[PDB]
Amino acid sequence: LHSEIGRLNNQSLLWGPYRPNIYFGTRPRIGKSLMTGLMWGKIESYTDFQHTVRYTCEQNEGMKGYGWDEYDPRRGGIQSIHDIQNGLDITTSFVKIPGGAHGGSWAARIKGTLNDDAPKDQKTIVVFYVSQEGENSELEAVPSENEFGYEGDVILKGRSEALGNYKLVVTKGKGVIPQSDHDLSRLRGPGQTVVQSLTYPDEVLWQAKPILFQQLKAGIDWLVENKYDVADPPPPWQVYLLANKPGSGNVHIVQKVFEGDFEFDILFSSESAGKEVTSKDLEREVKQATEVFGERFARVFDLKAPFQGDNYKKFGKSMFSNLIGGIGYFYGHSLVDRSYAPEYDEENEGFWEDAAEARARHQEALEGPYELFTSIPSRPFFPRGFLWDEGFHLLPIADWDIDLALEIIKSWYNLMDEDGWIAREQILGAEARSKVPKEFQTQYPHYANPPTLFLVLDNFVERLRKLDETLSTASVDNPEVGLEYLRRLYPLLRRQFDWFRKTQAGDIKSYDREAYSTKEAYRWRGRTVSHCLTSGLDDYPRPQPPHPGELHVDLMSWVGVMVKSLISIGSLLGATEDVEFYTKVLDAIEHNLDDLHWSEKEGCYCDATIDEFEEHKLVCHKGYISLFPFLTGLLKPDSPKLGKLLALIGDESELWSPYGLRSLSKKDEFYGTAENYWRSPVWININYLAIVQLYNIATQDGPYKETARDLYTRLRKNIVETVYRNWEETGFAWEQYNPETGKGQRTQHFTGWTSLVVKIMSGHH
Ligand SMILES: OC[C@@H]1[C@@H](O)[C@H](O)[C@@H](O)CN1CCc1ccc(CCNc2cc(Cl)cc(-c3cccnn3)c2)cc1
Numbered sequence: 001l002h003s004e005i006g007r008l009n010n011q012s013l014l015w016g017p018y019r020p021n022i023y024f025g026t027r028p029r030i031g032k033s034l035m036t037g038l039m040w041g042k043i044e045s046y047t048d049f050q051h052t053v054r055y056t057c058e059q060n061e062g063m064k065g066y067g068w069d070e071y072d073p074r075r076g077g078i079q080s081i082h083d084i085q086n087g088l089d090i091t092t093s094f095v096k097i098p099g100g101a102h103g104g105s106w107a108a109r110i111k112g113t114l115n116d117d118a119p120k121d122q123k124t125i126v127v128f129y130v131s132q133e134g135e136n137s138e139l140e141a142v143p144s145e146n147e148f149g150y151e152g153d154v155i156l157k158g159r160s161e162a163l164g165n166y167k168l169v170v171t172k173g174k175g176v177i178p179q180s181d182h183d184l185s186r187l188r189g190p191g192q193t194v195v196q197s198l199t200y201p202d203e204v205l206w207q208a209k210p211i212l213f214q215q216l217k218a219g220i221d222w223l224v225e226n227k228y229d230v231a232d233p234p235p236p237w238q239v240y241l242l243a244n245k246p247g248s249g250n251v252h253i254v255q256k257v258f259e260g261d262f263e264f265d266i267l268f269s270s271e272s273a274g275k276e277v278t279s280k281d282l283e284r285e286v287k288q289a290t291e292v293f294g295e296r297f298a299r300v301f302d303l304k305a306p307f308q309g310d311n312y313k314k315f316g317k318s319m320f321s322n323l324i325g326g327i328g329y330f331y332g333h334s335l336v337d338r339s340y341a342p343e344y345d346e347e348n349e350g351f352w353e354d355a356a357e358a359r360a361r362h363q364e365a366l367e368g369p370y371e372l373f374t375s376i377p378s379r380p381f382f383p384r385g386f387l388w389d390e391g392f393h394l395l396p397i398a399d400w401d402i403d404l405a406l407e408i409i410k411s412w413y414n415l416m417d418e419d420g421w422i423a424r425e426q427i428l429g430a431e432a433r434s435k436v437p438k439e440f441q442t443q444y445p446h447y448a449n450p451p452t453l454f455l456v457l458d459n460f461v462e463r464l465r466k467l468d469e470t471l472s473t474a475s476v477d478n479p480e481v482g483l484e485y486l487r488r489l490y491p492l493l494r495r496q497f498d499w500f501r502k503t504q505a506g507d508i509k510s511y512d513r514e515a516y517s518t519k520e521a522y523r524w525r526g527r528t529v530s531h532c533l534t535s536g537l538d539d540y541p542r543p544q545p546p547h548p549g550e551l552h553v554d555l556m557s558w559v560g561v562m563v564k565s566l567i568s569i570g571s572l573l574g575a576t577e578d579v580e581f582y583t584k585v586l587d588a589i590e591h592n593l594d595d596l597h598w599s600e601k602e603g604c605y606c607d608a609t610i611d612e613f614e615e616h617k618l619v620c621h622k623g624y625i626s627l628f629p630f631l632t633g634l635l636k637p638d639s640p641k642l643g644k645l646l647a648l649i650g651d652e653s654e655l656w657s658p659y660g661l662r663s664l665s666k667k668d669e670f671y672g673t674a675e676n677y678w679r680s681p682v683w684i685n686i687n688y689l690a691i692v693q694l695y696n697i698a699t700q701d702g703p704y705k706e707t708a709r710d711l712y713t714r715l716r717k718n719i720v721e722t723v724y725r726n727w728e729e730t731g732f733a734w735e736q737y738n739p740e741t742g743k744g745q746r747t748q749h750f751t752g753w754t755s756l757v758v759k760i761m762s763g764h765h
Pocket of ligand 1: 377381382386388389535536537538746747748
């Protein structure tokens with residue numbers, strides 16, 4: 001039965017618009033298969049289209065905004081795109097139609113509407129680019145009846161092992177096709193849809209823009225060669241219309257020119273399914289998707305007061321839809337330093353310089369290939385898997401569709417190597433590498449990241465203890481299925497746990513260090529003078545200088561998180577011997593957090609270092625780090641320490657801004673210094689954890705229940721209203737929020753853990 005659900009899941013999720021790095025495109029969850037992508041640009045001149053054409057996601061003054069209005073990876077969704085440069089409001093509706101044995105069918109409608117400022121007679125070039133990778137597979141454009149191009153639809157017929165037989169139709173569409181009275185029309189037609197079918201080696205098919213342009217440039221060279229010149233030149237849009245040449249190949253370019261508003265359909269019909277997909281099918285299934293989307297949202301994300309109004313609902317739908325809409329399938333080789341240079345052990349004083357020297361040996365090589373099915377933080381700026389981000393992304397996603405979340409967790413854990421390491425940043429294949437300078441691609445097997453994916457696991461567990469509709473919850477509704485999933489993941493869970501304890505160990509024994517346990521102590525590998533990238537809190541101030549005797553209270557707290565998850569999961573699987581070992585680790589961490597990290601003087605947790613005189617010194621920087629045992633749900637609800645942390649959290653002069661909790665206290669000497677990434681701004685993910693822990697304390701008998709209730713109430717309110725107000729004004733989710741002004745700053749399109757706001761509004765943790 002577990003096997004069966006797995007197969008149904010695979011079939012359900014196979015197709016999607018799983019290329020979030022581009023404005024619109026599709027691919028199945030198969031590394032070498034059929035991919036599509038959309039491009040458009042106005043043409044006003046002989047040289048402008050190279051600058052106007054859109055393909056990969058960006059965000060600048062030329063683009064008002066874009067994102068998903070509704071989305072569910074089982075069903076499809078609707079995206080709208082507001083393009084200032086090209087004077088166009090675009091809608092891309094995508095829908096999946098189950099059937100056959102090959103992952104079903106799908107359709108999309110592309111609709112472009114000129115805005116009020118666009119010239120009513122704008123010419124817009126639109127291209128649908130289709131590529132297929134694989135050795136024993138075929139794809140052919142059925143030739144036109146007409147001389148120079150297609151009057152009606154374009155039919156591509158193809159076949160592969162993965163997909164069987166299929167057809168892909170790009171329909172005629174609606175809208176004015178401009179017509180050229182130029183001489184050239186005798187050779188190139190007056191203007192019509194054209195197709196060029198081509199072949200390149202599989203590994204470069206992803207380079208759609210250069211492939212398109214090479215074809216355009218060859219068209220222009222031909223014009224020059226055949227005496228079309230500046231004495232009497234064809235219009236721009238005709239100069240940029242490819243010569244029709246459909247055929248066989250692994251690349252098919254379908255180009256249309258439209259004047260004014262336009263729309264057209266793409267119909268992918270899986271032969272093994274019933275009849276082929278039609279435009280009437282598309283319209284109906286889009287209508288049905290929206291309906292179902294609405295019904296699910298109201299149940300899953302029922303916004304509580306004072307966010308029950310329709311303005312907040314629209315906001316919630318957009319934040320949620322952009323987050324789940326970001327889901328991608330990535331495939332390819334990654335860049336990894338597998339030297340395990342001894343300098344990476346960071347055992348000496350001044351280790352960072354040693355580590356730099358090892359890096360400058362440049363032993364990193366490509367390995368894999370790997371695949372990953374994941375949501376991402378940022379379509380325009382970093383459309384790829386980040387390890388601790390995904391823990392946050394999956395929290396709202398799991399509400400929506402627990403089976404989807406488990407699928408993504410499973411996908412991440414399948415990356416894990418023999419030692420228990422998953423790179424914190426997953427750059428798979430040349431397409432993904434194109435977005436990343438070479439200097440930042442290399443992953444290091446000694447670099448951890450917070451294991452926030454356990455948080456998702458914890459939620460699954462609690463849910464477990466207490467057809468698309470069916471499939472979405474099958475792993476909770478069938479407790480047998482749930483347990484098998486856990487049985488199978490559990491060893492990698494344990495492996496990662498052991499990996500943390502092996503590779504990120506702090507040093508008690510070699511110093512004047514007294515604590516309940518000689519074992520429980522942690523130090524993030526990879527820190528430099530100004531940074532600790534692996535912790536997730538890039539420039540939060542740490543002991544200076546960095547030192548092998550450092551201990552990090554956030555890292556120990558993450559280990560606590562993992563061990564508690566292991567207790568619950570082990571217990572479920574009857575892994576008795578393990579659960580005894582875990583229990584003693586938890587007990588030791590509980591004590592050692594205290595012995596090694598608690599500052600009575602300061603009233604909070606501090607990281608630790610080793611002095612000039614070799615003694616254990618606390619290094620206190622009031623901020624998110626300071627709160628970690630609380631944030632990670634480690635403290636008892638009656639803990640006097642918790643009560644002091646509650647005081648710090650509520651304290652306006654320290655962490656509490658009208659906009660949420662500040663990353664670093666205004667009293668800290670490093671407040672608002674350097675790049676000020678984590679040195680003051682409000683981050684939704686850490687605020688999310690605060691809000692969750694406040695609510696836990698608030699709904700249990702105890703001494704701080706009422707303080708917790710007040711802080712919960714207000715923090716929820718401040719965080720939601722801040723993200724809402726900026727969304728209202730800018731159309732964007734942002735990376736972080738200014739505690740003085742409330743303004744979103746750093747990058748936009750951060751969906752991204754900022755989308756946690758839909759669960760904050762939802763409440764009832
Ligand atoms: O969320 C994932 C991670 C977290 O895991 C970490 O914990 C956190 O510390 C950071 N997070 C992001 C890590 C990150 C940040 C930044 C870049 C470079 C992006 N390049 C770029 C290019 C252009 Cl053309 C414009 C702009 C741009 C525009 C407007 C405003 N600001 N910038 C940016 C890569 C990766």
